Amino acid sequence: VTLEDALSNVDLLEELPLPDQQPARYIEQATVHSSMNEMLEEGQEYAVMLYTWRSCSRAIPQVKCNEQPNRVEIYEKTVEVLEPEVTKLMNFMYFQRNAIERFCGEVRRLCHAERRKDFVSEAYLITLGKFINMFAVLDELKNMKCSVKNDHSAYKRAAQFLRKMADPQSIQESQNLSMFLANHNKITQSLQQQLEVISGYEELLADIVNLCVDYYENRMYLTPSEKHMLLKVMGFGLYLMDGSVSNIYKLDAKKRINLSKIDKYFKQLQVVPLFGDMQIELARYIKTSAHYEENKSRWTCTSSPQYNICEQMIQIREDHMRFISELARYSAQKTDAEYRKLFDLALQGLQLLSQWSAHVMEVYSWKLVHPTDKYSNKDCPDSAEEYERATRYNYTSEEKFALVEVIAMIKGLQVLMGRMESVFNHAIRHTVYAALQDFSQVTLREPLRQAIKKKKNVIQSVLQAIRKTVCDWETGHEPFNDPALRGEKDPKGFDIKVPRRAVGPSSTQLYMVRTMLESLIADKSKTLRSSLEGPTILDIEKFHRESFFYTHLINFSETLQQCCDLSQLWFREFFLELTMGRRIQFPIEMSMPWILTDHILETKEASMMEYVLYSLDLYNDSAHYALTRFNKQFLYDEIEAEVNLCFDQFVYKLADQIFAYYKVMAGSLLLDKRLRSECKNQGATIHLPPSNRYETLLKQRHVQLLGRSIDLNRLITQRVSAAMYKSLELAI
Amino acid sequence: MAELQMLLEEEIPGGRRALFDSYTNLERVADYCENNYIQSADKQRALEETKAYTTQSLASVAYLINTLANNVLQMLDIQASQLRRMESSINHISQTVDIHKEKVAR
Amino acid sequence: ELTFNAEEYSDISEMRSLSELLGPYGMKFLSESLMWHISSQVAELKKLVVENVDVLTQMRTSFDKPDQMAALFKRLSSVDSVLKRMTIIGVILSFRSLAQEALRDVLSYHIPFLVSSIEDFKDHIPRETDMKVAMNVYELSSAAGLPCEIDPALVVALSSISPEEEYKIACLLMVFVAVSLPTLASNVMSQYSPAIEGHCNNIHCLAKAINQIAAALFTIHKGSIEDRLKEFLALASSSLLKIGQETDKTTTRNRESVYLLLDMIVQESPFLTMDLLESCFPYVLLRNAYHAVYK
Amino acid sequence: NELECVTNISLANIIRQLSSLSKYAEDIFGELFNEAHSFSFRVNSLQERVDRLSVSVTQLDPKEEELSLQDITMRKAFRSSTIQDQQLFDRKTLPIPLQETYDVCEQPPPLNILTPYRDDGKEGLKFYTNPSYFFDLWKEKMLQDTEDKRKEKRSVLLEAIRKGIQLRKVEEQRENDVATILSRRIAVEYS
């Protein structure tokens, strides 16, 4: 009935033995930002809907003649089965038209002559970049998907035969959707055409690209998704710039944008995962530029090495050890130093996990985009599908081992970080609150005093708004004896007690404070920066650059899970569409986790034996991704069907090799040593059996797969018992 | 051995029934607190009322989970001990059997 | 090259033949002699333990403050002699274990009825009973070569300074051994060899040495083995993890190989579980070390 | 106050999360109770069996023992159970929470209503997604590989023992199990 009693109950519950575990005007800006976010949530939904579309016309009983007894009978079934599927296409067309119109309207609004040299927040520019990336990915999904057109036009033949489209508006909308689907690169073309009509949009694209380049250069990102989004936005913006009116090459000579940095970034990193199993080639946006023909010499990224993951394992391993060692030592109230240490440790761990995930995704995408051939790889047969050469024969044993090791390290670090969820959350939130309060209550005092003293009302208003939005007065009100408010210098003084509690600021408050604070430092803004001294602006930039990751760290669990996403290693919709009905679904030997596990088992590598289980939860990750993001039942059904046989094969092979190794070791133990020495001297040495670490797998009783707990030990015991009985019978 | 059946068919089902009753009552209480906050003249009263309700429910859930968990642990301990006891009697039986076989051979 | 091959005298077949020739009396005599040697080694170790009592006493209370432990470790004298003696004790204990398992295998088919009766009696003996009858039961079981948790011969040897003072020395011995573990990382001979499943300087027997010595000492002094072994594990984990941050190749030549000592200790120790190791030492480091020592 | 309205909404959401936690505990506890109750049934049954066996064994008589040399192999031989678990990822094994998480997800299109109008009679939905495709293609490939692999490789007790060997010879040994298929391939790679 009281808070103290409830806390006590929780402690009591935790105290149980659990052995055998393992073996202003900113309001308008906020509203527009919210609207953009809402639009984005819908665009992502439409993109995921498009990605997971399968040809629905294949199952139709195609009619060869025009006088079939049931020709009229199947059209109603086709109509009633494809009506909702065409409703989705109509909704997608309406949504994309509305999104294009809204983006053009916002661009026009922010491109006005008087509004050109005003102040605009960086978040809005990032949102516009997200919008252009969404448009690009939607156009790519529309282009790649060749089954949507067939399904829609089959429904068209089904509806027109029944004469159910007699309504003129129905005919008009059907024609509009048909022509929308027929055209190639329709979304990009329409947006581009609507862009030239506006004058000066190149400047908005330019400052967006500059912001993205600055963010990428300073590593102003946490999750690999943002790292790839920055490059995708840069490329798409560069593509949009080149046209009839605006030329990047002439713009570059004006130093408005930097092309060398983008070229180097593309050269270092060439491919990123656009969506699902599809990857985007960054240099394509440049090679397809309007004026690329006469300026190809300017770009080295387009012309053509460093994706080999086997040569980067030393740094990965060393980093992993150093971090694990640092974290192990942090397994009643503490000082701010400990909380800051925990905060920085959590940030470093998240950054390292993101770096590893980015490396893995980049190498996977590069391998996908660069399939091998029998000329290069001798093992590859003459006949093979695109996915075969792309994945199965495109990896070496060392490369597979490196990938498995990286994945296992990522998952181990993830679980270790999750074990310390509460401590990390408390430390991060306490540090954030202390920093925010100390800043807003001490650092802004001197600047405020200066502003009041020199009658700077513009600065005074925003400073007071900042100090009123977040500051929490322990006394319940702003102090009245503060000399800064009166403008006269403080004595000698005036100690103020800042309270301390563990809570992060609300998203709205943090965004509002950041937007106000980085408005004072704005060069473009009569510049407000010109009305402030040096030390105050330096401290303001330091605080602004430090507070970037507050939102990400507050949602520590979501950020941690996002930085370790590996669900994109199983989906094969793109390659399935590239088959056009020949392959309904790829066999077992094409899913990367299965190839890794089978290679590890067959090669019988002692070092990699302990990673076989770590290389098996990719199925769980993919199932979670499908059930939470894609929300498609058939994907989960196929994953479960594949796992049902993958686990059986793995168990059988593991038991067989374990029994063989144990029998060989037993036989070698009893062999006479003098005979072995004599044979070695004579030149007939009997090779000893290499050691192995099967005991770790033998002591495993918690193998988790799709919510199922499997007792591997029981199956291994049954298999070894059968083998022993067979051996005894054979001996008899 | 009697306490095994007691703890099996009188404690665990009681905890289950209690936990399902808790889920239904908790949904009802969230709806009730939301309603009280907007059809009450004194918002602070509903807030305190809401705070009290949230504090309570947590304690009840924790207590039920603790009791249930304790019961499960005790049941497992009882079962393991009985299994161990059975293993001793079975070993004695096997010793008697092979002794009889050796006697027959002699 | 020596004049004899140890593999032609310590093999299972050779050990089985030696046990058959000797019998329980001969095996008991050999075990008694080995326990005499181990008792001499422990008596020599106690001198080094007592001569550094002051630093060790402060070390136990400062495990959470590395700043003072770094300076304290520099004042310790003869940090390698203790490791060498513990390695010798571990080698002797491993030889005893080989002899005992050979004897158990030999007797398993010669007198099956008596062996089965002894196994049944020992297995179902309540541990709550006082050590007075448990020692006799363990002695009877070990006479046939059974794997008793507590070695009665070792207890008798080590039983043969006030009572409170002898307990403090025993407690400080574990702390002294724990802090000296990282010193092995700088030894070039501490390289783990997969073909041997152990280190080249026999430092892998340190686990058995520590476990047996702690058990005997803390059952002689009516101490708590579990608690004392848990203290040893915490101190050893902290010392090893501090090494992980360091980058000097010379001092960390075989750090990964040394990291496996905790895993071996937990595996072969009947009083420690993997849960305790995980709470103070992540298993990912051990997995990475196992990967590295194989290539 | 808008802030006061927010806190009330947060408290309601917290109560909902408490209910979700209640269901995350209840399902686990129910599953544990079910499995432990089955274990208790097994233990009680084997306890009855053990006491019956003990009361039977405490009556044996060495003089009663009679050995028949002729019946030594005429006797059926005893074999221990050799049951092996398989198909561990079937629908029946799906936990309830995953059941709610899945049944709420989008269902596949009703392509199964077109089967009557198909000349071959093949299931319409199988043209959309075929979970059994993995199994059938893998089995076909394994059989084809095995078929290629074989080509690539290429007194009265006296009466009793005679009868035993005759029975063993005549009574020799007599599929959609992956283990059987693999055992066939490796045995074929051998002769």
Author numbering:
A (entry chain A): 5 to 27, 57 to 337, 341 to 367, 380 to 540, 542 to 574, 578 to 784
B (entry chain E): 1 to 106
C (entry chain B): 822 to 981, 987 to 1121
D (entry chain C): 24 to 177, 499 to 518, 528 to 544
Quote the passages of the study that discuss this structure, keeping the authors' original sentences.
The Rho-family GTPase Rac1 activates the WAVE regulatory complex (WRC) to drive Arp2/3 complex-mediated actin polymerization in many essential processes. The WASP-family member WAVE exists exclusively in a 400-kDa, hetero-pentameric assembly named the WAVE Regulatory Complex (WRC). The studied complex is composed of a trimer formed by WAVE1, Abi2, and HSPC300, and a dimer formed by Sra1 and Nap1 subunits. Rac1 binds to WRC at two distinct sites—the A and D sites.
Firstly, we tethered Rac1 to the C-terminus of Sra1. In WRCD-Rac1, D site Rac1 binding did not cause obvious conformational changes; neither did it destabilize the meander sequence or the W and C helices. Compared to WRCapo, WRCD-Rac1 does not show major structural differences (0.46 Å r.m.s.d. over the whole complexes). Consistent with these observations, the pyrene-actin polymerization assay showed both WRCapo and WRCD-Rac1 were autoinhibited and could be activated by the addition of free Rac1 (blue curves), whereas WRCAD-Rac1 was basally active (solid blue curve). The D site engages with Rac1 mainly through a largely hydrophobic surface of ~550 Å2 presented by a.a. 961-978 of Sra1, which contains a helix-turn-loop structure formed by the H11b1 helix and the loop between H11b1 and H11a helices. This Sra1Y967-Rac1F37 core interaction is further stabilized by several polar interactions at the periphery, including a cation-π interaction between Sra1R964 and Rac1W56, hydrogen bonding between Sra1Y967 and Rac1N39 and between Sra1H978 and Rac1Y64, and two salt bridges, one between Sra1E974 and Rac1R66 and the other between Sra1R961 and Rac1D38.
